[PDB]
Amino acid sequence: GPSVFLFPPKPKDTLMISRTPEVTCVVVDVSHEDPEVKFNWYVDGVEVHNAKTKPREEQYNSTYRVVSVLTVLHQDWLNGKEYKCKVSNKALPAPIEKTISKAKGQPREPQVYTLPPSREEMTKNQVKLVCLVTGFYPSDIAVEWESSGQPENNYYTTPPMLDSDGSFSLVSWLNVDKSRWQQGNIFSCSVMHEALHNRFTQKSLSLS
Amino acid sequence: VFLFPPKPKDTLMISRTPEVTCVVFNWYVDGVEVHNAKTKPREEVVSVLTVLHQDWLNGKEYKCEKTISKAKGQPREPEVATFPPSRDELTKNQVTLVCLVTGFYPSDIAVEWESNGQPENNYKTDPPLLESDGSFALSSRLRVDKSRWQQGNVFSCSVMHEALHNHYTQKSLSLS
Numbered sequence: 507g508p509s510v511f512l513f514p515p516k517p518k519d520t521l522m523i524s525r526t527p528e529v530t531c532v533v534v535d536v537s538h539e540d541p542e543v544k545f546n547w548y549v550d551g552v553e554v555h556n557a558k559t560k561p562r563e564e565q566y567n568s569t570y571r572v573v574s575v576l577t578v579l580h581q582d583w584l585n586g587k588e589y590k591c592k593v594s595n596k597a598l599p600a601p602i603e604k605t606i607s608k609a610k611g612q613p614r615e616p617q618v619y620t621l622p623p624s625r626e627e628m629t630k631n632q633v634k635l636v637c638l639v640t641g642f643y644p645s646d647i648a649v650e651w652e653s654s655g656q657p658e659n660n661y662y663t664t665p666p667m668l669d670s671d672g673s674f675s676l677v678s679w680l681n682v683d684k685s686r687w688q689q690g691n692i693f694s695c696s697v698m699h700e701a702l703h704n705r706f707t708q709k710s711l712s713l714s
Numbered sequence: 715v716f717l718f719p720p721k722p723k724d725t726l727m728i729s730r731t732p733e734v735t736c737v738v739f740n741w742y743v744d745g746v747e748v749h750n751a752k753t754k755p756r757e758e759v760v761s762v763l764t765v766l767h768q769d770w771l772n773g774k775e776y777k778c779e780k781t782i783s784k785a786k787g788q789p790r791e792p793e794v795a796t797f798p799p800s801r802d803e804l805t806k807n808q809v810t811l812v813c814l815v816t817g818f819y820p821s822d823i824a825v826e827w828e829s830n831g832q833p834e835n836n837y838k839t840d841p842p843l844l845e846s847d848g849s850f851a852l853s854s855r856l857r858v859d860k861s862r863w864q865q866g867n868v869f870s871c872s873v874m875h876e877a878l879h880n881h882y883t884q885k886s887l888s889l890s
């Protein structure tokens with residue numbers, strides 16, 4: 507019969523209040539013989555009714571995919587509320603339930619440090635700026651780079667790694683054209699994490 | 715049966731002994747049968763094949779059925795950069811040194827911190843991460859007492875990789 511996957515919001519969406527975090531319950535392998543699907547949603551076991559369910563969409567393998575999207579409150583997600591999606595379909599012997607929530611554990615604040623390039627690399631046409639993010643918990647985080655209020659997306663970020671004290675660390679580095687750096691343009695590392703004051707901090711660097 | 719490669723430093727340093735390890739035995743180098751596999755007795759089992767550094771590095775295939783070999787692809791030399799602590803972090807009694815290693819292929823590498831001939835405690839090194847151009851990158855972070863940093867002690871990031879000259883480079887830093 508059908509199967510169910512339940513997807514959490516992305517951390518940046520739960521962390522910036524102007525953004526729109528959603529939980530998404532997806533049902534696949536819905537047959538033609540029994541195409542009707544019903545969703546019941548619960549937040550800490552209490553039924554909610556504000557989900558937006560899309561009509562069924564036939565896939566190229568001749569089964570339907572049915573999607574329901576629950577809008578969450580940012581504070582609810584961050585306070586560890588459990589979101590349950592129950593899926594009924596007449597081909598099932600019983601409804602399928604799936605539950606998700608934010609990673610448990612005592613939040614710890616990242617400290618963020620930016621590191622300017624080496625001289626060695628400055629004899630190439632690109633250069634590396636490093637953002638060192640340390641001491642955070644849980645691992646959920648967003649790290650992004652920007653310049654002049656706009657994204658600088660030519661970066662890589664290490665996945666979070668466990669230190670010996672139980673908290674996480676990572677590095678992000680941004681590859682910029684060397685002329686841009688020499689010209690004195692300011693680059694900024696933006697870190698979004700539930701344990702930061704206002705869930706956001708930015709650290710900036712430029713040449714001297 | 716699950717077959718394991720040698721570790722990076724073992725293939726790159728000629729004084730070390732690289733081994734392929736077949737855990738749970740026949741053994742083959744590029745199809746041909748070999749008979750130097752020291753097996754050791756089952757424990758409520760593992761077989762070890764000592765390999766030649768150059769055979770591993772030339773891409774020979776080791777068969778135990780699972781086969782293993784070095785990752786295929788043109789080797790690319792790592793670039794190594796070191797960063798002193800942020801002046802912001804200097805307000806704490808621990809500070810961080812960063813060694814940034816980028817543009818290498820294959821992923822097999824050893825990136826280690828040392829001072830005065832000896833390994834440094836309290837470091838963390840990421841497993842290598844795939845970049846857009848097909849190469850790999852990683853960072854290694856050493857945490858030291860501000861005391862040692864400010865006193866002018868010299869810290870070194872040693873990197874061992876097949877595409878380096880002598881399979882080795884060392885980049886050091888200290889206060890100004």
Ligand SMILES: *[C@@H]1O[C@H](CO[C@H]2O[C@@H](C)[C@@H](O)[C@@H](O)[C@@H]2O)[C@@H](O[C@@H]2O[C@H](CO)[C@@H](O[C@@H]3O[C@H](CO[C@H]4O[C@H](CO)[C@@H](O)[C@H](O)[C@@H]4O[C@@H]4O[C@H](CO)[C@@H](O[C@@H]5O[C@H](CO)[C@H](O)[C@H](O)[C@H]5O)[C@H](O)[C@H]4NC(C)=O)[C@@H](O)[C@H](O[C@H]4O[C@H](CO)[C@@H](O)[C@H](O)[C@@H]4O[C@@H]4O[C@H](CO)[C@@H](O)[C@H](O)[C@H]4NC(C)=O)[C@@H]3O)[C@H](O)[C@H]2NC(C)=O)[C@H](O)[C@H]1NC(C)=O
Pocket residue numbers: 509511513514515516519527528529530532534535565566567569571
């Ligand atoms: C018929 O066709 C069906 C549809 O497929 C089309 O695909 C083509 C390639 C082609 O084949 C077409 O013909 C075909 O029609 C097909 O359906 C598929 O069924 C699979 C199961 O058989 C499903 O596999 C699962 O996928 C999960 C990951 O899925 C995401 O990733 C894929 C890969 O890119 C993507 O295609 C999916 O759509 C899905 O995308 C996510 O979508 C959500 C929601 O929209 C996004 O989240 C939202 O994003 C918005 C902004 O857009 C906003 O940010 C919201 O807030 C946010 O919620 C995600 O961003 C997006 N993610 C991406 C892109 O990465 C796997 O996780 C899952 O793995 C689990 O289950 C396995 C068993 O099935 C198990 O072995 C595995 O270990 C794992 O187990 C889980 O472990 C977790 C933690 O470790 C636990 O949390 C779980 O409890 C645990 N689960 C267990 C044990 O069960 C799984 O592999 C596939 O998704 C589905 N495809 C689609 C499109 O729905 C069908 O199978 C076909 N049938 C036949 C018979 O062929």
